Design a binder for these strands. Sequence first.
DNA 1: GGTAGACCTGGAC
DNA 2: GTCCAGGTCTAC
Length: 314
Amino acid sequence: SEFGHRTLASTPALWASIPCPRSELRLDLVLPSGQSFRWREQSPAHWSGVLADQVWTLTQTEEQLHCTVYRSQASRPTPDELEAVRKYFQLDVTLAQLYHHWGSVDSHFQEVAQKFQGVRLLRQDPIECLFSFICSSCNNIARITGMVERLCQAFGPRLIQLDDVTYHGFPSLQALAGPEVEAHLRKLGLGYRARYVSASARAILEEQGGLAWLQQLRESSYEEAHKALCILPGVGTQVADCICLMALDKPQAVPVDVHMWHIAQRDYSWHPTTSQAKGPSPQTNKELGNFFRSLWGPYAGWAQAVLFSADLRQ
DNA sequence: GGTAGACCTGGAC
DNA sequence: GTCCAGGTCTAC
Ligand SMILES: [Ca+2]
Ligand SMILES: [Ca+2]
């Protein structure tokens, strides 16, 4: 059918594949795992969301990642469009090589890895990432998802409508920094997060030199980037690490939340050796990130994603 | 320098 | 009805 969300069966000629075995990527273990909060499984095994300013639907078979895009006459995705998809999933980073290494250095990762293959990091937009995670504060993945889409519906560009879903592009800096945005976000249920969204939008635009400041962080060192990000209102150590890891190409960045504390304790009998505190605190959190980084290497943030994800299923 | 308490809320046990 | 989720900010 010409309407509604597509499916591999439904509209055969509208899809194009990207070679990709399930061992290198698993949508159901990545898309709803707290990295991006903008993907939904409309029909079973089919995920629809905004990717590179367009709406896509993705579904995978054992060796292929099937993609379809909604923009002109309907048609399969072009090689360039598909390239953007390959880019978003950083398919050039070989998950098999990373899992192997992590496995040989961490007997525990080995055990968990066997059952949770295909977990990788998405290369996200700094702006979308920065604001989505500002909303992470004392919040669960479902509530976060709700806030973010409401935020996008209210200040994001209208893209296309499939069934009763009107997809929106992520709001721009200028839009989020607009008069009365906070008040609006509060009526949307973001709570005290409304304030930080507005504050950070204005901060970047009226104090840091704008969008470029954020984007230039991809060329900066992990340390510089993380240091810079913490300046923004509502952006602490954890949020900045998420941004570094998920959007600034800092693969060693390890977000330390309660989840990783439970993992560190239960699975590694970890204890803080520096800080004198027995639980989560700025100094012990820093210490843990260094513990994982020392344990897994340069792509510790990635290894972190595999366990965080596995810890969510449970 | 290293804590405790304030800040919002929808789904839980 | 108290509890919990990918926290952060700041006053003592
Ligand atoms: Ca929490
Ligand atoms: Ca800050």
